[PDB]
Amino acid sequence: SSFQDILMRMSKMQLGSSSEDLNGMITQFESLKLYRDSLGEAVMRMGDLHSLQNRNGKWREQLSQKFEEIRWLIEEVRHRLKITENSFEQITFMQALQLLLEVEQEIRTFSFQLI
Amino acid sequence: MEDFVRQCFNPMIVELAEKAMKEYGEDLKIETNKFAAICTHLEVCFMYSDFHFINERGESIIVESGDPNALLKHRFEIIEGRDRTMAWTVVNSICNTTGAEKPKFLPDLYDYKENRFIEIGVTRREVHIYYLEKANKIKSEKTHIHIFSFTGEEMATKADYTLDEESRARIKTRLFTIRQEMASRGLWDSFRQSERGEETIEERFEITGTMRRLADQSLPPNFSSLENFRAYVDGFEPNGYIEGKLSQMSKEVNARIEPFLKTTPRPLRLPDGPPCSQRSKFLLMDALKLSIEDPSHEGEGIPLYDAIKCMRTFFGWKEPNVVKPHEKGINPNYLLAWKQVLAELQDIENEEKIPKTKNMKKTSQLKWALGENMAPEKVDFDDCKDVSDLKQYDSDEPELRSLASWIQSEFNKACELTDSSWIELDEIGEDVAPIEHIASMRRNYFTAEVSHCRATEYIMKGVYINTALLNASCAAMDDFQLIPMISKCRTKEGRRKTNLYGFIIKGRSHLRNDTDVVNFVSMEFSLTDPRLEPHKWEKYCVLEIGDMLLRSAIGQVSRPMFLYVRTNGTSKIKMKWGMEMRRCLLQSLQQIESMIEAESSVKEKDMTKEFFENKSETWPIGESPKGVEEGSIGKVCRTLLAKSVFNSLYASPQLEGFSAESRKLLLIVQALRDNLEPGTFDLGGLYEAIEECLINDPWVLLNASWFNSFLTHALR
Amino acid sequence: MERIKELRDLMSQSRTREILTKTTVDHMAIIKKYTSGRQEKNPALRMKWMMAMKYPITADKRIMEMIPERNEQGQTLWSKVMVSPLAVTWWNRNGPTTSAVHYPKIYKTYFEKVERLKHGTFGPVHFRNQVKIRRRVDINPGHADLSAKEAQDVIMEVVFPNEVGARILTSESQLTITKEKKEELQDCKISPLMVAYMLERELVRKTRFLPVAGGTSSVYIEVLHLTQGTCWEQMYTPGGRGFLILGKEDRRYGPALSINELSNLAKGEKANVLIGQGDVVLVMKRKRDSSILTDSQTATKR
Amino acid sequence: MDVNPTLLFLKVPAQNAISTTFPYTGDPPYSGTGYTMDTVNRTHQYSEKGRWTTNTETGAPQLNPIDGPLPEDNEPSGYAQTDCVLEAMAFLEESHPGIFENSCLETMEVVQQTRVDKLTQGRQTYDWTLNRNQPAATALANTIEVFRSNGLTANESGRLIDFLKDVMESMDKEEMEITTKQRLNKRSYLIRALTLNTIATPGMQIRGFVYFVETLARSICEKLEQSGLPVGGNEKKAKLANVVRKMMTNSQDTELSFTITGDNTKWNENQNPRMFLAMITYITRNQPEWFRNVLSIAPIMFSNKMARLGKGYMFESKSMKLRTQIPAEMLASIDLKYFNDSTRKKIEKIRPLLIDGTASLSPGMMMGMFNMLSTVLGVSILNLGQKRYTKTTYWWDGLQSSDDFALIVNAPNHEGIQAGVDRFYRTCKLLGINMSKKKSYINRTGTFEFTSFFYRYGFVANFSMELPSFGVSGINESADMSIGVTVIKNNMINNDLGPATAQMALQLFIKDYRYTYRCHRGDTQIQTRRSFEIKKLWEQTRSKAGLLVSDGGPNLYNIRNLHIPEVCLKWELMDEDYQGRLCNPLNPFVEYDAVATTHSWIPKLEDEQMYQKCCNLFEKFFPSSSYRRPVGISSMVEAMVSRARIDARIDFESGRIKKEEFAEIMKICSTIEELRRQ
Numbered sequence A: 001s002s003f004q005d006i007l008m009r010m011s012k013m014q015l016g017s018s019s020e021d022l023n024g025m026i027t028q029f030e031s032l033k034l035y036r037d038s039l040g041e042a043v044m045r046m047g048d049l050h051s052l053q054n055r056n057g058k059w060r061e062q063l064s065q066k067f068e069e070i071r072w073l074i075e076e077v078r079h080r081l082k083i084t085e086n087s088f089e090q091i092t093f094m095q096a097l098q099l100l101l102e103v104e105q106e107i108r109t110f111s112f113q114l115i
Numbered sequence B: 001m002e003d004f005v006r007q008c009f010n011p012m013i014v015e016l017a018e019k020a021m022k023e024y025g026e027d028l029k030i031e032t033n034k035f036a037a038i039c040t041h042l043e044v045c046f047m048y049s050d051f052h053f054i055n056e057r058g059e060s061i062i063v064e065s066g067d068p069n070a071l072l073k074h075r076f077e078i079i080e081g082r083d084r085t086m087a088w089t090v091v092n093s094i095c096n097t098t099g100a101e102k103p104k105f106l107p108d109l110y111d112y113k114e115n116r117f118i119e120i121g122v123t124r125r126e127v128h129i130y131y132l133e134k135a136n137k138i139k140s141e142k143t144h145i146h147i148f149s150f151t152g153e154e155m156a157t158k159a160d161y162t163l164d165e166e167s168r169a170r171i172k173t174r175l176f177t178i179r180q181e182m183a184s185r186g187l188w189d190s191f192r193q194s195e196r197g198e199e200t201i202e203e204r205f206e207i208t209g210t211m212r213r214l215a216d217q218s219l220p221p222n223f224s225s226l227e228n229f230r231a232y233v234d235g236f237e238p239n240g241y242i243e244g245k246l247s248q249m250s251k252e253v254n255a256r257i258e259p260f261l262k263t264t265p266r267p268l269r270l271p272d273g274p275p276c277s278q279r280s281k282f283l284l285m286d287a288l289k290l291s292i293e294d295p296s297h298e299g300e301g302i303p304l305y306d307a308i309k310c311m312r313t314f315f316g317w318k319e320p321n322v323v324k325p326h327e328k329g330i331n332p333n334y335l336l337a338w339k340q341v342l343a344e345l346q347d348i349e350n351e352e353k354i355p356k357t358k359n360m361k362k363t364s365q366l367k368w369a370l371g372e373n374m375a376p377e378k379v380d381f382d383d384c385k386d387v388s389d390l391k392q393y394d395s396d397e398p399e400l401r402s403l404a405s406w407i408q409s410e411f412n413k414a415c416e417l418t419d420s421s422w423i424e425l426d427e428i429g430e431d432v433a434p435i436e437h438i439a440s441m442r443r444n445y446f447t448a449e450v451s452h453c454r455a456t457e458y459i460m461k462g463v464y465i466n467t468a469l470l471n472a473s474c475a476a477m478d479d480f481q482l483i484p485m486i487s488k489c490r491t492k493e494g495r496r497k498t499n500l501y502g503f504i505i506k507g508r509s510h511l512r513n514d515t516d517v518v519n520f521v522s523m524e525f526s527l528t529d530p531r532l533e534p535h536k537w538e539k540y541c542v543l544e545i546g547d548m549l550l551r552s553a554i555g556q557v558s559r560p561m562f563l564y565v566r567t568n569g570t571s572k573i574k575m576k577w578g579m580e581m582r583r584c585l586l587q588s589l590q591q592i593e594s595m596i597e598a599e600s601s602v603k604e605k606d607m608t609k610e611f612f613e614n615k616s617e618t619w620p621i622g623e624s625p626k627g628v629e630e631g632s633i634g635k636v637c638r639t640l641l642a643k644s645v646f647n648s649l650y651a652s653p654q655l656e657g658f659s660a661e662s663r664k665l666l667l668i669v670q671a672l673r674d675n676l677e678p679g680t681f682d683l684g685g686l687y688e689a690i691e692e693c694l695i696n697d698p699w700v701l702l703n704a705s706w707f708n709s710f711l712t713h714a715l716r
Numbered sequence C: 001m002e003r004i005k006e007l008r009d010l011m012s013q014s015r016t017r018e019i020l021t022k023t024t025v026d027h028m029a030i031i032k033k034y035t036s037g038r039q040e041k042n043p044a045l046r047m048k049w050m051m052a053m054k055y056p057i058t059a060d061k062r063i064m065e066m067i068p069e070r071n072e073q074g075q076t077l078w079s080k081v082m083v084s085p086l087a088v089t090w091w092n093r094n095g096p097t098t099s100a101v102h103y104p105k106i107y108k109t110y111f112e113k114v115e116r117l118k119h120g121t122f123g124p125v126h127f128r129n130q131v132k133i134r135r136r137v138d139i140n141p142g143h144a145d146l147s148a149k150e151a152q153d154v155i156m157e158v159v160f161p162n163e164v165g166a167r168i169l170t171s172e173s174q175l176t177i178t179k180e181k182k183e184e185l186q187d188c189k190i191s192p193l194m195v196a197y198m199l200e201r202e203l204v205r206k207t208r209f210l211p212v213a214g215g216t217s218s219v220y221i222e223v224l225h226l227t228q229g230t231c232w233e234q235m236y237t238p239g240g241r242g243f244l245i246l247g248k249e250d251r252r253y254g255p256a257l258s259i260n261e262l263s264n265l266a267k268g269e270k271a272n273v274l275i276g277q278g279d280v281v282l283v284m285k286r287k288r289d290s291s292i293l294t295d296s297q298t299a300t301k302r
Numbered sequence D: 001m002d003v004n005p006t007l008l009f010l011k012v013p014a015q016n017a018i019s020t021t022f023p024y025t026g027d028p029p030y031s032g033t034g035y036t037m038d039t040v041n042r043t044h045q046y047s048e049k050g051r052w053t054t055n056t057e058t059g060a061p062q063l064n065p066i067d068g069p070l071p072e073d074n075e076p077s078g079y080a081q082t083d084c085v086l087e088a089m090a091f092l093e094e095s096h097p098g099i100f101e102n103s104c105l106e107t108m109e110v111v112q113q114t115r116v117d118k119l120t121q122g123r124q125t126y127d128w129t130l131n132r133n134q135p136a137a138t139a140l141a142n143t144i145e146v147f148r149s150n151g152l153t154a155n156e157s158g159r160l161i162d163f164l165k166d167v168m169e170s171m172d173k174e175e176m177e178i179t180t181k182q183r184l185n186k187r188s189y190l191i192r193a194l195t196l197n198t199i200a201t202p203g204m205q206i207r208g209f210v211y212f213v214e215t216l217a218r219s220i221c222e223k224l225e226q227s228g229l230p231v232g233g234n235e236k237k238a239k240l241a242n243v244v245r246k247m248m249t250n251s252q253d254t255e256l257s258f259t260i261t262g263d264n265t266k267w268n269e270n271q272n273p274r275m276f277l278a279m280i281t282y283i284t285r286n287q288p289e290w291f292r293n294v295l296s297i298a299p300i301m302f303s304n305k306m307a308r309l310g311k312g313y314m315f316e317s318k319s320m321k322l323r324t325q326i327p328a329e330m331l332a333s334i335d336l337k338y339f340n341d342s343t344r345k346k347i348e349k350i351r352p353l354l355i356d357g358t359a360s361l362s363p364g365m366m367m368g369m370f371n372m373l374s375t376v377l378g379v380s381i382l383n384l385g386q387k388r389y390t391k392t393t394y395w396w397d398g399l400q401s402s403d404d405f406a407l408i409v410n411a412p413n414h415e416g417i418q419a420g421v422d423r424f425y426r427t428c429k430l431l432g433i434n435m436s437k438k439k440s441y442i443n444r445t446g447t448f449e450f451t452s453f454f455y456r457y458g459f460v461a462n463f464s465m466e467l468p469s470f471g472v473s474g475i476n477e478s479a480d481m482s483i484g485v486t487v488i489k490n491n492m493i494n495n496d497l498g499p500a501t502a503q504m505a506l507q508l509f510i511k512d513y514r515y516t517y518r519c520h521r522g523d524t525q526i527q528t529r530r531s532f533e534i535k536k537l538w539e540q541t542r543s544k545a546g547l548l549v550s551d552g553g554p555n556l557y558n559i560r561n562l563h564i565p566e567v568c569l570k571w572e573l574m575d576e577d578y579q580g581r582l583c584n585p586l587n588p589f590v591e592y593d594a595v596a597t598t599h600s601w602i603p604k605l606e607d608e609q610m611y612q613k614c615c616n617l618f619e620k621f622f623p624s625s626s627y628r629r630p631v632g633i634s635s636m637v638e639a640m641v642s643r644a645r646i647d648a649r650i651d652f653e654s655g656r657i658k659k660e661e662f663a664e665i666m667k668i669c670s671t672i673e674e675l676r677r678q
Helices: A002-016 A021-043 A049-083 A086-115 B002-008 B011-025 B032-048 B084-098 B125-139 B163-187 B212-216 B226-232 B241-248 B303-311 B329-345 B364-369 B407-414 B434-448 B452-473 B572-579 B583-601 B633-649 B651-672 B683-691 B700-714 C002-012 C014-022 C045-052 C085-094 C108-118 C148-159 C176-184 C194-202 C293-300 D005-010 D015-022 D033-045 D080-096 D099-112 D116-120 D136-149 D160-170 D186-193 D206-223 D236-248 D273-283 D289-294 D299-301 D341-353 D371-383 D414-430 D477-494 D498-516 D530-542 D576-582 D608-621 D636-654 D661-674
Strands: B076-078 B109-111 B116-123 B143-149 B154-156 B290-294 B319-324 B358-360 B391-392 B480-490 B498-508 B518-527 B541-551 B556-570 B618-622 B627-629 C120-125 C133-138 C207-210 C231-235 C243-248 C270-274 C281-286 D051-054 D063-065 D123-126 D132-134 D177-179 D182-185 D195-198 D256-261 D306-308 D313-319 D322-327 D357-361 D395-398 D404-411 D439-442 D447-450 D453-456 D459-462
Touching: A002 A086, A021 A049, A021 A086, A049 A086, A086 B407, A086 B556, B002 B032, B002 B163, B002 D636, B011 B032, B011 C293, B032 B076, B032 B116, B032 B163, B084 B109, B084 B143, B109 B241, B116 B125, B125 B154, B143 B163, B143 B241, B143 B556, B163 C045, B163 C243, B212 B226, B212 D299, B226 B241, B226 D273, B241 C133, B241 D080, B241 D414, B290 B303, B303 B329, B303 B480, B303 B498, B319 B329, B329 B358, B329 B480, B329 B498, B329 B541, B407 B452, B407 B633, B407 B700, B434 B583, B434 C120, B434 C231, B452 B480, B452 B498, B452 B518, B452 B583, B452 B633, B480 B518, B498 D306, B541 D136, B572 C120, B583 B633, B583 D015, B583 D459, B583 D498, B618 B633, B618 D005, B627 B633, B633 D005, B651 B683, B651 B700, B651 C085, B651 D015, B651 D033, B651 D439, B651 D447, B700 D005, B700 D459, C002 C014, C002 D608, C002 D636, C002 D661, C014 D608, C014 D636, C045 D498, C085 D530, C085 D576, C108 C194, C148 C176, C148 C194, C231 D341, C270 D636, D005 D015, D015 D453, D015 D459, D033 D341, D033 D357, D080 D099, D080 D273, D080 D371, D099 D206, D099 D273, D099 D289, D116 D136, D116 D160, D116 D206, D116 D661, D123 D136, D123 D182, D123 D195, D132 D136, D136 D177, D136 D608, D160 D236, D160 D414, D177 D186, D182 D186, D186 D195, D206 D289, D206 D299, D206 D371, D236 D395, D236 D404, D236 D453, D236 D459, D256 D414, D256 D447, D273 D371, D341 D357, D371 D395, D371 D404, D395 D414, D404 D414, D404 D447, D447 D530, D477 D498
Parallel strands: B116 B143, D195 D306
Antiparallel strands: B076 B109, B109 B116, B143 B154, B290 B498, B319 B541, B358 B480, B391 D313, B480 B498, B498 B518, B518 B556, B541 B556, B618 B627, C120 C231, C133 C207, C243 C281, C270 C281, D051 D063, D123 D132, D177 D182, D256 D404, D256 D439, D306 D357, D313 D322, D395 D404, D447 D453, D453 D459
16 A cells, blocks of 8 residues: 555656656666565465475575665665655655565564564 | 504595594604504594484483484584584584584583583593593583503493493493503503693604704814704705816826736745744644554443553553653653553552542642742732833744645645545435435545545544533543543454544643633654754654554564644634534535536536546646646545644644635636636735734644645646 | 511511612512622532532432332432432332323413424425525414413413402403313322413414515414425425402501402492402402493493 | 536536535634734825824814815725715705605604614623723613713713713813722713724714614615615616616617726725715705714714724744733833734834724724625715716716625716716715725626626526524524524525425434434334333324324424424314323423423523513513513602512402411512611
């Protein structure tokens, strides 16, 4: 729901004005959404942790480098929220920042769960 | 009176009275009392000489009804109901026939039992006074006097009544009934009118000293007294003074029409300065709840016990910390008060007799927070006139603040659909009329699109909190009472929930008036970090109190939990305003129905299935970078409900003024869109009036921005 | 005994005695308007506060004998009288039962409204911009054969027969409506004042200016919230003695009388009676036969 | 997106959605001496070019702008020309012959046959006996008491004119004493009799004269079509359509028709009482001198009126932490250092007018009082728009109220429209009528506003009435149901309350009623203190549809039956025993229609209630006094003593009273007669 609303708001920003990196930011946002969906699918598969052992062998590197772009994306969103003066953009960026902060913690607890 | 007399008297008496008054030269429209008195005099005289005859021999009879037998004298002569000259001629003729004494004054009737003239009198005052007056006026002549009253009293000359007791009783009863009828109608004010012997005077309202002198100084110049002014006005004709004055009038006095075109309007100028901050009595979109699914047992109950249960459901309390200081108050006192609230709630688990309402110990932090630290003393000016720094209470201009984006975020979330119901309305009778069916359709469509609304949650929140505050203020005037912030709702499975938002600690509430302020400290849970929009929380001290644990598909993730603390105040008028927030539902339904009815008057048909049930139709109720955004009917309903709720929730004189003036500007813009050629006389003045109320209120500034967007998009 | 003691108490005071001795009975409607104010401290909140507590209602002392002190469940119903609303519900549940046969006659107008609505017929609802015209429409249809004053006299002779004025008491011939209303309400116990008010509603015509876009038959005006609105019209068809005043009180003719004992004194005997709301008068039965007719012909003989 | 409710007007016309531009539904939860001083300063500034005089009776400075210099700028001006006002009045009489004479004839009856108790009907009134606002009845009683203490006994006849004669006579004596034993000299009494307290209230000496003037003004206005004040509801919506029909019925359509949605905010401050005196003098020509005198007193006392400043100012000290209240009475000698920049300018500009604690405000009028007469004055200008008066191709017509006005101007071309608007404006200025060219606008006829009535192509929307309260009233639960349904039914008829809105108001009222009286329906799970009894009654009842809502019954109310009392509405569905219980006259407990039942229960000047004790005692001897107005020439004491004697006599012979008690009653009656001769 939060992803849906935020991505809808960013699409309006993309077309109302020029695509000033917003296109890449949005692409990243759907990438992260699908990534989180895959994590939820694996969590449902938790019923069989045996296959999750190999999936976690992958998740080591996958989590590390995904966390990398997540932290850098949070930094970028903070930077955009700091410089923007348009109310629509400010609301969109604050919602995105809160969502990213929540998702970072979700993936962090999943990472501790699979060690 | 004029209407009454033409109903209590037969036509002949009224005609005779009118003829007599015309002969005397008076108008009954101005002297109704004299008309009534003369009509009463005539009727009594006729009743006196009725059914009485002189027997053929030396005897009198009282034979009644028609008497064609003839051969009987009438026993009386009517003299009152005749012209002055004719009456005098008749009097002279009868006096000569009987050789009596001609009275100096005109008589009323003549008696054949004794050669004497009878003058009848009806008095609206004491009988003996009237008899004495008549005797003094009528003297030295063999004249008989008979006096009747409206109260049943009577007297004649030397107590010599010249009629049968039955007839006199009939006259007395007639007068008595007339008096009752006048008193019932309120016309018995003529009691004083006939108090001067002659009932011809009109009312007298004089202007004399100290009022004749005030009158002479309250009239246009060049006139000495009010009598000269009356003389001037009485003789006055329209000689054409307005035309001459207009000719002499300067041409700079004009109402010139300045066209209002597509390009004349300009955006409203909003203030500059620090961003505005939140000012509501409770959190709206940052509010967090601790909920319990109370197993039925409806009927409110004990809010303190519900709060205790909702608190027990939560695990995660940590050591309180200040994450965003208030910067205008002692911050350690705020977490001290929070710790005291926690400890006091833990104490209720002791003291076997469980209390229904909790009172907080009056400690230093709680006294400071609740303004218990002595307020300025009510000294007398005669002694403290040398304090130097003695100025007016306000003596300060209102600060200018710029519109922040969080007030649009609040309104966006208010118009959203929640998961709970928040309102259950009572049933009404089954519909039988087609209009009743249309009303039910509109009402049900509206209620279905508004029950699960966040703005409907705010209504219940405000109602509950203000009711609890008023009850505590009335019942616990002299102690610090802990008041849970509680609301109730229903889930999709129709399951009751009690929600805990926070706690209010009331101060000492000795409210004589309806504007007396009771201070309180609000402590409200939230998951919102105060460091993302720190300017929105200028009046709050925010503490980090725990770690809420939220379930998700991937897992159960922990988030920090905060406590927004601030000192606040309220009065009885404000509490009652909060308690009446359910009228916002009525206002929004009334607005939607007015829209439907206005579109129904045109097209001469019921436009109820076109607003609802027509998914294709959409209204412009929002804005994005792409432009104007369209919404469905139910979303329009929720938006109007949220607008009403925020109007009630941020009520201020600035809002009232801005609405009043932006209404006129909106109507001018509409006239431009209707091709009605709008014009103005001072558009700059209207803009100044609109912008004088744009100072620091987030709601009014957001409304001004909304109007600016409307101006951009409407004239395009 | 209590009323006269209170009167003596009032006239013991220097100010209240002045009012009692100077104000005539005529000028009471004026005096009744000299009151105080500032009492509505949000009476809805007052009622909520009163219903919150127990024993909010006041009842007569007989409450203790008719209704038991405690409920079947153990809930107290009254106390020393101050009574709980649970006592009202208890009375409606298993209190004494009586015959409610007078109610259809006393409240005949309300039941007439109920019957008119029950058998009414609804047509279609039409959406137009119709124009409503301001008209003198009668809200309450009074009796056709009774004038405004005659209606009040009937209400006065049927509810307060002991305080009828000289107009009623000294007028020969009695209306049939009064005779039938007296027997209809012979054993009525509802209340004299409520009976008088309902009789006023039934017998006295009231008129007002309403802007109406249809009939004005007094049955289309009661249903006006229902038939016309801002932009719509709803088609609807509704279902379907003689005495003579002689003067003030005379002490030679015995003590004063009330207006019920005049029925049997004598033909042509003098007695004094307290008529209306005040002054005592000396009256007799009209020995002769006096009637109102074309007195113009009789007077024209002069 | 970002929700913007204002964007809805891009699809819906302003008039159809104008209801959304009204923020509140009810009085807002917010609300001084500074405003009073600002009002006084503005009133004297708008007319500062007039003459200055000192009152010989009060010593107060007074400003007289009548017949002053003609204005030369578009600022508010109080320089109303007397001859222009009289000419406008003459032309109004000419266009409606016999209007003033007929109005005076109708008003003389009200003047002669009005009772003093008519003066108890009103909101809070200034009490000179206490220098405080009091309820109308209390203030009238206090004035009567203080007048009686002095040699002023003429209102003891039940006539308002006699009480006003007492008022006129009070100002003649040189001493007025108030016992609570205060003493007032002539000048102080006059100052307190001409005081307008604080959106302003006159004392209980100008109210009767104002009432008579307003009766005359209502009589005049009832005969004028342009007058929009006296009417209200769906007959004002008729005036709005009628004026447009009058001005739009053109033959061989070529004329242009424009409508000014006028505003006259704060136009009372330029209404001089002297022009109202000229108005009344011209209206009452060739009438009895007493009537002219009585009608010509309220403007006389308004020309000399005086505004009480109010409470005053409050001061603060941040060092010593103290507060003080400074009454406005002593705000004529305070040093100006304490006050703020804006406030000291006000106190400096108003000091010359301050006398005896009140500002002297001769020019101008305050809201209220002369609403009808100001409407007459406005209709006078609207009357001049006829072509017979505007001897030109342009003419105008419109509506007039005490708060707003509407104007329609018809001319062959746009230049003619400008000429007509200019002439209307300049004629308004000559009579002291100041149009607000800041809140007024003009457009072609077809759409306009008048007193919150929005007209759009024949459709009128009434948004001038606040949505009323739909909660309990605070009386027995029998009367609250009747009042609640009647209020809804009456708002549907008068204030254009929609069917659906009325149904939902009914729902909210039933919710509030059930929660106040704890009478939730018998089949619900809500557990109040009253639930057990209601559930027992529910179970024992066969027909659970005749039960009242007070007995845990269903709500059968809808639109069709809001005019029917609940007991009658449910009578046919009632159980016979439940009828006998509910409708039992012998039960312990006891403008709306309600049947008396067990639910009609009752919950919990040296003598203020002295008047409401003799009447209640009379009602015990004469119960008919609660239904009809008593009539009688005897005193209260005589009536009650005779009633008691007759009742005791008849009661002793009937055996219901023993001989000793009868003798005691007779003895007390003899004692009461003895007291009657003191």
